[PDB]
């Protein structure tokens, strides 16, 4: 239930999400809490891209571990 | 004697030393027929930009004296200036390797000032707008200046 | 021998290029999502984003299952940077649930400022190879990766990675085909990666990129590589 969401520029933010409920609304209420729009950030749990459907259960999430947040990448 | 010494190692202190003359001493000293050389001066001067009344005024005063001279030269390709500027800010690719400057705040603020000035060819605005967008890393570190600059270009 | 963009292939592409709901999901696999926004980066000389690349790389990975083709693992575009600036310790759990040594090829898309690039680990020829469509040499990203393999071998297999015979290459400008514009690095990254994983030599040039850009759109929508 207890998670840490850490951006590249090292800025922690703790969430109180439910064991079973989708991470969509976490992602939604993170980007609405730190300024930027949805399609600018990607949410990784130890490498794995977190999609809206992802349950904290359907990856071995413990009551502490870190979700990493990454920039949109662009290059030509 | 200095002015050159400034350019070698730009500092807010050195710039404030030169006097109100600093604007033109810089502008006269750079071969304003060559866009690469003008980009060089531009970044050097804008690298000492600070939220600080006297320094801010000085940095913008150089930029203007310089750029007004540039845009006023018949040998000065402004398109190549923009291309070389963005290459140097690390916002565009280039066949030649470049020092890719580390901090864009100054540069971004100088541009914000430049675009708004009478001397600036408005035709260049839309062009510059399209490279201030593309989600580049070094830009999202200066959201404000980026956003401040975008607003200017819309309006000018 | 390059299949044509047919008329109905054209219609499909032109549709997703039109403006609309930029968050509209156009393609879904690998628990990834391709929105109208992501697809637009393949339009004209638009710079391709990470979504296009990871997606495509995952497609190369899914194709590598069919017989005759070298098995492929592909790291996401955020992997190398995180390996580079933070230590190995910050990427180690990324390869849990993957025996990285049980495959022939590892694909590592690289993101460098305004540049897309690609490194490739090939356990068959025993080398780490860097490809940069701009002629840039990262002689050194190979060393980073080589160190990664040693660090991963200890961590995941409990034994030290053998190193004899291995080499580190960065491809010179006159031996893989280069960009002629400031915009196609992603396409080159992807298409080099396409050729390499098919065991076929890189025989395309800049002249093929508009066609590849459009064709990739159909490929991504149909999740079928031509």
Swiss-Prot record, chain A:
Residues at the site labelled Interaction with PIAS2? 15
Region feature (Microbial infection) Interaction with Tula hantavirus, mapped onto this chain: 16-19
Domain of life of the native organism: Eukaryota
Cross-linked residues for Glycyl lysine isopeptide (Gly-Lys) (interchain with K-? in acceptor proteins) are 76
Q: List membrane-spanning regions.
A: none
Where is this chain's protein located in or outside the cell?
Nucleus membrane; Nucleus speckle; Cytoplasm; Nucleus, PML body
Entry GO CC: cytosol; glutamatergic synapse; nuclear body; nuclear membrane; nuclear pore; nuclear speck; nuclear stress granule; nucleolus
Which is a GO BP term held by this UniProt record? DNA repair
Post-translational changes noted in the entry: Cleavage of precursor form by SENP1 or SENP2 is necessary for function. Polymeric SUMO1 chains undergo polyubiquitination by RNF4.
Cross-linked residues, Glycyl lysine isopeptide (Lys-Gly) (interchain with G-Cter in SUMO2): 2, 16, 18, 24-25
Q: Give GO terms: molecular function aspect only.
A: enzyme binding; potassium channel regulator activity; protein tag activity; RNA binding; small protein activating enzyme binding; transcription factor binding; transporter activator activity; ubiquitin protein ligase binding
Tell me which residues make up the Ubiquitin-like domain: 1-76
Keywords (A to Z) from UniProt: Acetylation, Cell membrane, Chromosomal rearrangement, Cytoplasm, Host-virus interaction, Isopeptide bond, Membrane, Nucleus, Phosphoprotein, Ubl conjugation, Ubl conjugation pathway
Site of covalent link Glycyl lysine isopeptide (Lys-Gly) (interchain with G-Cter in SUMO1): 4
Residues the record lists as Phosphoserine modifications: 11
User: Main role?
Assistant: Ubiquitin-like protein that can be covalently attached to proteins as a monomer or a lysine-linked polymer. Covalent attachment via an isopeptide bond to its substrates requires prior activation by the E1 complex SAE1-SAE2 and linkage to the E2 enzyme UBE2I, and can be promoted by E3 ligases such as PIAS1-4, RANBP2 or CBX4. This post-translational modification on lysine residues of proteins plays a crucial role in a number of cellular processes such as nuclear transport, DNA replication and repair, mitosis and signal transduction.
The UniProt entry's sequence similarity note says: Belongs to the ubiquitin family. SUMO subfamily.
Q: Can you say what this protein is called? A: Small ubiquitin-related modifier 1
Organism equals Homo sapiens
The portion of the full protein included here is 22 to 97 of 101
Swiss-Prot record, chain B:
Q: Give the N6-acetyllysine positions (modified residues).
A: 93
Q: Summarize the PTM comment.
A: Phosphorylation occurs before nuclear envelope breakdown and continues throughout mitosis. Phosphorylated by the M-phase kinase cyclin B/Cdk1, in vitro. Differential timimg of dephosphorylation occurs during phases of mitosis. The phosphorylated form remains associated with RANBP2/NUP358 and the SUMO E2-conjugating enzyme, UBE2I, on nuclear pore complex (NPC) diassembly and during mitosis.
Which residues are in coiled coils? none
Effect listed in the UniProt record for changing residue 93 to R: Loss of cross-link to SUMO1. Abolishes association with nuclear pores during interphase, and with mitotic spindles during mitosis
Phosphoserine PTM positions? 4, 11
Record localization: Cytoplasm; Nucleus, Nucleoplasm; Nucleus envelope; Chromosome, Centromere, Kinetochore
Q: Write down the position(s) of the site called Hydrophobic interaction with UBE2I.
A: 131, 134
For the cross-link Glycyl lysine isopeptide (Lys-Gly) (interchain with G-Cter in SUMO2), the position is: 21, 93, 155
At the top level of its lineage, which domain of life is listed?
Eukaryota
Sequence motif SUMO conjugation, location on chain:
92-95
Summed up, the tissue specificity of this protein is: Highly expressed in brain, thymus and testis.
* Residues bearing PTM Phosphothreonine: 5
Locate residues linked as Glycyl lysine isopeptide (Lys-Gly) (interchain with G-Cter in SUMO1).
93
Similarity remark: Belongs to the RNA1 family.
What is known about what this protein does? GTPase activator for RAN. Converts cytoplasmic GTP-bound RAN to GDP-bound RAN, which is essential for RAN-mediated nuclear import and export. Mediates dissociation of cargo from nuclear export complexes containing XPO1, RAN and RANBP2 after nuclear export.
Quaternary assembly: Homodimer. Interacts with RAN. Forms a complex with RANBP2/NUP358, NXF1 and NXT1. Forms a tight complex in association with RANBP2/NUP358 and UBE2I/UBC9, the ubiquitin-conjugating enzyme E2. Interacts with UBE2I; the interaction conjugates SUMO1 to RANGAP1, and subsequently stabilizes interactions of sumoylated RANGAP1 with RANBP2/NUP358. The complex composed of RANBP2, SUMO1, RANGAP1 and UBE2I associates with nuclear pore complexes. Identified in a complex composed of RAN, RANBP2, sumoylated RANGAP1, UBE2I and XPO1. Identified in a complex composed of RAN, RANGAP1 and RANBP1.
What's the name of the protein?
Ran GTPase-activating protein 1
* Protein's gene: RANGAP1
Q: Complete protein: which residues are present?
A: 432 to 587 of 587
Swiss-Prot record, chain C:
Q: Where is this motif: Nuclear export signal?
A: 217-226
Kindly identify the residues recorded as the active site: 115, 132, 185
Cell compartment(s), UniProt: Nucleus; Cytoplasm
Gene Ontology BP annotations: negative regulation of proteasomal ubiquitin-dependent protein catabolic process; positive regulation of transcription by RNA polymerase II; proteasome-mediated ubiquitin-dependent protein catabolic process; protein desumoylation; protein sumoylation; regulation of definitive erythrocyte differentiation; regulation of mRNA stability; regulation of postsynapse assembly
**Region of interest (Protease), residue spans:** 32-195
Tissue occurrence:
Highly expressed in testis. Expressed at lower levels in thymus, pancreas, spleen, liver, ovary and small intestine.
Q: Give the UniProt keywords, A-Z.
A: Cytoplasm, Hydrolase, Nucleus, Phosphoprotein, Protease, Thiol protease, Ubl conjugation pathway
The record lists the effect of residue 116 to A as: Abolishes SUMO2 processing and SUMO2 deconjugating activities
TM regions (residue ranges):
none
Which coarse location class describes where this protein primarily resides?
nucleus
Question: GO: which molecular function terms?
Answer: deSUMOylase activity; endopeptidase activity; SUMO-specific endopeptidase activity
Result after altering residue 50 to A: Slightly impairs SUMO2 processing activity. No effect on SUMO2 deconjugating activity
Q: Which GO CC terms are listed, alphabetically?
A: focal adhesion; glutamatergic synapse; nuclear membrane; nucleoplasm; nucleus; postsynaptic cytosol; presynaptic cytosol
Look up the domain of life of the source: Eukaryota
The consequence of residue 111 to A is: Impairs SUMO2 processing activity. No effect on SUMO2 deconjugating activity
The entry sums up its family as follows: Belongs to the peptidase C48 family.
Subunit structure, as described in the record: Interacts with RBM33; promoting ALKBH5 desumoylation and subsequent activation.
From the Swiss-Prot or TrEMBL record, give the protein name: Sentrin-specific protease 1
| Species of the source | Homo sapiens (Human)
């Amino acid at each position: 239930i207890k998670l840490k969401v850490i951006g590249q520029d090292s800025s922690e933010i703790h969430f109180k999400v439910k064991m079973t409920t989708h991470l969509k609304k976490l992602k939604e209420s993170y980007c609405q809490r730190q300024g930027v729009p949805m399609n600018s950030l990607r949410f990784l749990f130890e490498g794995q891209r977190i999609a809206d459907n992802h349950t904290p259960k359907e990856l071995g999430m413990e009551e502490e571990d870190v979700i990493e947040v990454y920039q949109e990448q662009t290059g030509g | 004697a200095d002015v050159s010494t400034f350019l070698a190692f730009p500092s807010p202190e050195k710039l404030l030393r030169l006097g109100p003359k600093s604007s033109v001493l810089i502008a006269q000293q750079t071969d304003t027929s060559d866009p690469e050389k003008v980009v060089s001066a531009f970044l050097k001067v804008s690298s000492v930009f600070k939220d600080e009344a006297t320094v801010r005024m000085a940095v913008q005063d150089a930029v203007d004296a310089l750029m007004q001279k540039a845009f006023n030269s018949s040998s000065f390709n402004s398109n190549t200036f923009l291309t070389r500027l963005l290459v140097h800010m690390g916002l565009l690719k280039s066949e030649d390797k470049v020092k890719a400057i580390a901090n864009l705040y100054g540069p971004l603020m100088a541009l914000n000032h430049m675009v708004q000035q009478d001397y600036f060819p408005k035709a260049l605005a839309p062009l510059l707008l399209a490279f201030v967008t593309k989600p580049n890393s070094a830009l999202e570190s200066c959201s404000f200046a980026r956003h401040s600059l975008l607003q200017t270009l819309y309006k000018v | 021998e390059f299949p044509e963009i047919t008329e109905e292939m054209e219609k499909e592409i032109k549709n997703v290029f039109r403006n609309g709901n930029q968050d509209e999901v156009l393609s879904e696999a690998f628990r990834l999502t391709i929105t109208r926004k992501d697809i637009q980066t393949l339009n004209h000389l638009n710079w391709l984003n990470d979504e296009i690349i990871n997606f495509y790389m995952n497609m190369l990975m899914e194709r590598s299952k069919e017989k005759g083709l070298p098995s492929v693992h592909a790291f996401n575009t955020f992997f190398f940077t995180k390996l580079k600036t933070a230590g190995y310790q910050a990427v180690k759990r990324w390869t849990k649930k993957v025996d990285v040594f049980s495959v022939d090829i590892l694909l590592v898309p690289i993101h460098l400022g305004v540049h897309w690039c690609l490194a490739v680990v090939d356990f068959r020829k025993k080398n780490i190879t860097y490809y940069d469509s701009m002629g840039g040499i990262n002689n050194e990203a190979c060393r980073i990766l080589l160190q990664y393999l040693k660090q991963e071998s200890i961590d995941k297999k409990r034994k030290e990675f053998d190193t004899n015979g291995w080499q580190l290459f960065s491809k010179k400008s006159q031996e893989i085909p280069q960009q002629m514009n400031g915009s196609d690095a992603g396409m080159f990254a992807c298409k080099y990666a396409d050729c390499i994983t098919k065991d076929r030599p890189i025989n395309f040039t800049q002249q093929h990129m508009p066609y590849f850009r459009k064709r990739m759109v159909w490929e991504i929508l149909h999740r079928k590589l031509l």
